[PDB]
Structure formats: C-alpha cells, structure tokens
Amino acid sequence: ASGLFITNEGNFQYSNATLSYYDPATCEVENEVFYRANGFKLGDVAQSMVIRDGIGWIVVNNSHVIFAIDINTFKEVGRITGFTSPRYIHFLSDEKAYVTQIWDYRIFIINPKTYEITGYIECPDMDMESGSTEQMVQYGKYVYVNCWSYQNRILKIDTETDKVVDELTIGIQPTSLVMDKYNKMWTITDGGYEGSPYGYEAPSLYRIDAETFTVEKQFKFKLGDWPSEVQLNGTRDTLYWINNDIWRMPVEADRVPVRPFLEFRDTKYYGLTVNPNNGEVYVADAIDYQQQGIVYRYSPQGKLIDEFYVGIIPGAFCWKLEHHHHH
Ligand SMILES: [Cl-]
C-alpha cells in the first residue's frame, strides 16, 4: 500500500535521529520504524531519503553513512560508510549514483549494487573547510547541483565524464533545487545570517533555464528571512517553499503571490513535500527544535486533513508509491 516516510534529524551530536512511516489511507503514523525493525539506532541527523525499486536509501548526515532498507519491512539490506558528511543521493543507474557532501569539495560516486564508493567528482574553487554540494536535478546527460554552505553557485556535471563542466554564480547560499515541467530549475537562497563570515543579504528565489544555464527570473525577499526547501507538485507546475509561511506559485507566474499557502503560526516550518498523485501538501513543523515534531497534512485547496506527531526535527519526506518494477 502507498505510504510516506518522514526522516527526523533529531539533535546534533545527540544521535536521536529517527524514521517515521505514515499511511495516508488510515491516517496512522509509526515512529522509530528503523530502530524497531533493525534493533540499532539510525544515527545522528538523518538528512534525506530516496526510494528506488523496492529499496529505500536513507542518508544520515552526521553518521557518515547511507542505509539501504526494504521499504516494506524497514529491515536493512545494505549500507555504505565513509562519507564525509552526506547530504543527498541521486541515481544515474543501478550501479552508479552521486552523493553530495558538506565540509568537502568532492561529490562521492558510488555503486549501489556493491555498496561501495567508486570515485569522486572534484568541484572547482572550493575546499574541505567550507565545501558544500546539496540537492541535485538531472537534465539529460547532465546533473545540476546547488552549493549551499558558504557557497553561492550551481554546478553543471556531465554524467558521461563525471566532471563539472560549467557553473553559475547567484545569490549566497542556494538551499535546494528542483526542475519544473518546462525544464526550468528553481532554487532559493537563505541569505546567510547576521555576523556570518561569508555574508548576510536579502535572499531570493531563482528560475534558471536548464538548457542555457541562465537566470530568467529572480524574486528577492526581505533581509532577515531564511527561506528554504523548494518543492514541486506532481505535474511540476506549482512550486512550494518555506519562508516563515508555506508559499506556493505557478511556475509560469511573473511574481510571488501576496498571500501564502499556509500562514506562519509562531512555530518552525522545517520540512515540506507534495503528494505527486493528489497534490496534498505535507508540512513538517520542528516546533522549537526541541520537543517532538509534528506533520500537517493539507488538501491542495489548503484544508487541514490530518496532523500527526513524528520525531525530533522532521525535515525530509520520501513517498512510497505503488508500482510494478521492471524485470
Ligand atoms: Cl528509527
């Protein structure tokens, strides 16, 4: 049956990260599913998750590892260690995938089938001290990736050579990256922070053409905002993101709407996702980064459907959609 995974960062150096699994049909959530199925802790700061042919890959940022589990039993089928500080994983094939990192100038290349690191992609003009590669989107034989922490550019990678072939400098610290149905990528910066050794400025939302790798639209916000998590709906024509409130806009719009999708409620909207089949929007609220977090489920029209408590600091989602795998 269809379901939704929710990773929970937990607290840094507290090794209290956990995995939750929610059933939209029953409105029931199960917490600490990884530990309950495996007998050992997920780790420190679970960061993201992807599902590929009956296998879920969970990135645990501060545990230097990626866990491969059965999406039904949640039991571990394999794992890859040795990562500096893993962020996201993007599959190119059953034997090749990229794993971005923070505190590293290299993008780790791995072989999912053998569960080992096979190589590295060196990013130009960055080191280990402040290096950072985050989310990735694929465009034909190319893969685009945003450089977040103490960085200000998007890199273009040729998957046929595993090398960076181009770059684009934009606002400081782009946080995420998605591709719409017009082959236009979207990224939103967080503008750094006050007293930052790198910079502090008003953040912006960018619309960049994938083919020409050029900025087409730039929507600048207010100084002090720390936006993040650009997300798209199933048809990839409605963009959502976080900036105090949960915002949304048609990808063809010439301006950001004056009203948000979900108003700020003095808490801490941290994670976000949209059901690719029905458009329902799920918002992960960290509350205060201390107590147990909560997830809100809204209809496309913005009606509250359900809410459920998960783990500490829920920040990422992964949909488990039913479908027949190829043989
Ligand atoms: Cl768990």
Side-chain angles (χ1 to χ4, degrees), residues 18-19 32-35:
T18 63
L19 180 65
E32 312 189 329
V33 309
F34 178 94
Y35 173 71

Side-chain angles (χ1 to χ4, degrees), residues 47-305:
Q47 175 69 196
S48 64
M49 177 180 185
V50 170
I51 288 176
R52 186 187 179 75
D53 302 304
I55 301 174
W57 301 75
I58 309 165
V59 182
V60 194
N61 174 256
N62 200 41
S63 290
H64 314 287
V65 59
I66 291 178
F67 283 109
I69 62 162
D70 181 285
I71 64 174
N72 294 301
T73 64
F74 308 137
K75 296 208 62 179
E76 184 197 338
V77 291
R79 81 180 65 170
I80 305 172
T81 57
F83 302 114
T84 306
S85 189
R87 305 298 293 173
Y88 295 78
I89 181 169
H90 175 75
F91 288 81
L92 290 308
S93 76
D94 283 25
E95 307 166 10
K96 176 179 170 183
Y98 297 156
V99 182
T100 44
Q101 316 279 319
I102 185 175
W103 310 130
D104 204 317
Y105 68 85
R106 305 164 301 168
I107 292 176
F108 286 46
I109 305 174
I110 63 173
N111 180 324
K113 200 147 61 184
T114 59
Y115 295 106
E116 59 173 64
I117 302 177
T118 60
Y120 302 104
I121 297 180
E122 298 187 1
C123 296
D125 296 347
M126 85 166 66
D127 51 41
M128 306 288 292
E129 293 68 25
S130 65
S132 171
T133 47
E134 195 77 350
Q135 298 184 185
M136 303 170 270
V137 293
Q138 179 158 3
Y139 180 61
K141 69 180 182 179
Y142 298 109
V143 163
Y144 281 105
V145 48
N146 69 286
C147 302
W148 173 56
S149 191
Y150 298 142
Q151 299 300 325
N152 64 174
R153 37 181 180 145
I154 301 304
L155 301 180
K156 186 178 185 181
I157 299 170
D158 188 328
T159 65
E160 294 181 2
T161 66
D162 295 317
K163 295 186 182 301
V164 175
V165 299
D166 206 356
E167 63 175 53
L168 175 68
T169 296
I170 51 173
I172 68 173
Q173 304 190 171
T175 66
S176 39
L177 192 67
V178 293
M179 184 78 86
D180 66 33
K181 70 179 189 179
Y182 301 89
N183 276 159
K184 258 54 161 162
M185 68 186 31
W186 296 80
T187 185
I188 191 166
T189 71
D190 62 15
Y193 58 94
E194 186 179 298
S196 174
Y198 189 61
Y200 184 37
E201 74 194 15
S204 298
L205 174 64
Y206 295 85
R207 183 182 108 193
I208 307 160
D209 186 56
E211 184 62 28
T212 64
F213 203 9
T214 57
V215 174
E216 304 192 328
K217 286 283 186 56
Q218 189 188 332
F219 308 92
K220 182 162 293 188
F221 305 110
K222 180 179 179 176
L223 178 64
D225 295 335
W226 60 101
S228 65
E229 286 299 300
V230 281
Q231 287 289 316
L232 288 171
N233 63 338
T235 45
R236 298 169 180 263
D237 41 33
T238 297
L239 183 79
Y240 292 76
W241 70 89
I242 306 171
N243 189 187
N244 296 309
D245 311 273
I246 297 303
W247 302 83
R248 78 168 174 189
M249 159 192 70
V251 298
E252 311 98 337
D254 287 306
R255 79 162 193 170
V256 175
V258 292
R259 284 284 293 168
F261 173 71
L262 180 66
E263 300 183 357
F264 172 65
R265 65 182 59 179
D266 288 275
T267 53
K268 300 288 184 177
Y269 294 163
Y270 192 66
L272 178 71
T273 191
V274 181
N275 182 303
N277 296 317
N278 55 40
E280 284 173 19
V281 183
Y282 289 70
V283 175
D285 193 344
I287 307 299
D288 62 354
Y289 307 113
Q290 293 171 171
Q291 54 190 294
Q292 174 177 31
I294 182 175
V295 175
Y296 296 117
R297 171 186 182 181
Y298 286 91
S299 71
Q301 301 70 53
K303 182 170 80 296
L304 175 63
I305 296 170

